[PDB]
Amino acid sequence: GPHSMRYFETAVSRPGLEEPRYISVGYVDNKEFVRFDSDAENPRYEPRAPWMEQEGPEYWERETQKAKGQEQWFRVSLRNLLGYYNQSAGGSHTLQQMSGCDLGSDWRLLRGYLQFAYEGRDYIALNEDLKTWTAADMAAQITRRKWEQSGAAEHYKAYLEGECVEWLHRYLKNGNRTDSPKAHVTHHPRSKGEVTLRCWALGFYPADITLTWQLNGEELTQDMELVETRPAGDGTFQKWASVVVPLGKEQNYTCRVYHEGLPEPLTLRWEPP
Amino acid sequence: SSLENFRAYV
Amino acid sequence: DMKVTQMPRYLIKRMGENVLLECGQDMSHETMYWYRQDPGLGLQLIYISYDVDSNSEGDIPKGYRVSRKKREHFSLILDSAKTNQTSVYFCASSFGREQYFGPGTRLTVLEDLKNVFPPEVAVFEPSEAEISHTQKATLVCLATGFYPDHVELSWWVNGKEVHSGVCTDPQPLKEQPALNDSRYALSSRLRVSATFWQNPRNHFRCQVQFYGLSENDEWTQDRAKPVTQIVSAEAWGRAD
Amino acid sequence: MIQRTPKIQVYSRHPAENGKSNFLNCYVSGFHPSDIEVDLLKNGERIEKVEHSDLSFSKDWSFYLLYYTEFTPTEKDEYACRVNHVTLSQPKIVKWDRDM
Amino acid sequence: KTTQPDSMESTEGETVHLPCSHATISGNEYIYWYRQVPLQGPEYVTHGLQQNTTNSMAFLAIASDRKSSTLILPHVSLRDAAVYHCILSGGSNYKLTFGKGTLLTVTPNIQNPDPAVYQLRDSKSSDKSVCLFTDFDSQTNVSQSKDSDVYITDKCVLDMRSMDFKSNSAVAWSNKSDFACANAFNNSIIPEDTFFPSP
Ligand code: NA
Ligand code: NA
Ligand code: NA
Ligand code: NA
Fold it and tell me: Coiled-coil segments, which residues (chain B)?
């Protein structure tokens, strides 16, 4: 079916030192599979998923060399940015890059991505056509003119339409897979005659999920308390949603869990003894 | 397989 | 707009002296390069500069070092000139598209300056037989007895430098073919119509700029110091 | 330039069971710039063996990291996460509650 | 690495096709073309990543498999004679490796040849002379003398643009008294109708 690959790069300038702080994290279907980190004793790309451990030495040496190239590209770019913004002083000048591709069931490029941020805001992005750029401000317009003159978009398009798609195929074959949520309801004291019912969804992947509380198929008037979706640390996610209900009425309430890995949404409740 | 940026800097 | 500068075009240095070759580009490109090219061989990269103080050795860095303190300039330094560093050095810059090259500096490193000679320049007037046969007139300029091969020949008609109707020998001839230190001869032609040659108000000048010794170059020889100079030969048109 | 302070969540990898090995997590997200200091505390004392995920970011460019350590919960042991960031006037401490 | 033929010869005004083979090219490598006139700074001509590119200087055709390419120069000028270098340039790389390239020679199309050997006299001295071989068709090449005391230049093309006129010439000179314009170019294959004005 549909699949994706992304690389999330962060570079923080340290112009008084040899190179910027640089980290690249790669994802396949939003799951981390590789990473390069300059904060490491011996910086190199490493597998972050067991199915990558069968790639071969040439792959790792090749990826590492590209990262050393990116480190220099980020270092010179950050010096240019320092000048575009009139040497405005700061200890954390940040350039971020996200790139990658979406593959369809029919193996075509659905969408190619390339976008940059400087100082936490959009800077320049390659448009969906993989031919034109959207510039966020005056400084980004300088970059846009430079890249239009040098034909930069063609290099990125060729990567997104080619190498990105080819390697995403290779990875999917190597890695041979959604994890459905397992839910349960916990019961907690709250006030005199009232109780908190907390619906937990655990062990799910992807992170996208919806939790709702209902009474006899109808929505509740109260607003649910919820927590933002959070990683468990094993590649799976957690979330909960709670309601305050009268003591002795708990069994009547139902939690529904909506997730792509579920043939149909879950329905569960707290069962009294 | 990672993208190596086009030689033209920002 | 896209211009890389290099001066001088030619330089003579004694063996063991230091050398500084300069390159400039006012477009503030981040990347600059130093290459050398020996005759019959290709351009070889000495050093590349990715930015200020970010220099990497190329294919043949031995005997050279570089300086990049500002993006507009890139210097090549030879701490102790070797005769085998006699070559043509080209600098280049890039913004990420193509590389833009400078016009080059021809460096000749010599053990001593005893064989350094300026050219003697002569103009040979058009033959009456050519004038009658073709209604055209060819002037020949010969620049002879010079060493090293550090000349720039140009033609000037009525005080204006001309390129039309001109051809200069792409390579000089050796006055004594059997010698490695042979002096050179170079010829050039300037062709005009017979009517233009027949006007006595028309002035022709063959100019040869020779790049020889400098002021800070010590000269202990008896003969006239072969300094950098212009040597010319002139002729006027005539009716008969 | 945009700076954003981290949102913090402190929780266990699996539902807490006294005397059963687990992982204590401190999830920092929505922050900018990426420089951050995160400590996990056991009864107010800094835990030594703490690891963290590889720095990445969300669609609004804000960073996120997970800090974690193996722990065996008990009825009385107390845990927290302590975060410092340039947008904070003082470190922010979040206590672990097993029911949340 | 690229592979090109060592040489290509052409007459001005015709189309020149400069082939280049690069069977081990990678997806991210551009095909760049640079040219260099002897002793002058190299100059960018064109580049492409895939298929065809047209600019004021040339046309570049890249095969669908990207394993070969061709630089096409329609209606070549004498100003196009140079060594042409086809080089692979990694999209992320600033370095280039110049190879041998193809020496392209372009000969003028002499409309009305009138081969002749003229004797030219020095402006200031009456004893100094030079022999000028000129107006011959581009097919003739000029050899050095069999005598080491005789200096013979290679042929040179001059272009008088004001008229639609080009001419080839070579110069010969010597100090030996046995030397004359009638014998000067004896070691070359010159036209049988070469004009030798009678002194
Ligand atoms: Na320029
Ligand atoms: Na006149
Ligand atoms: Na390809
Ligand atoms: Na194309």
Answer: none
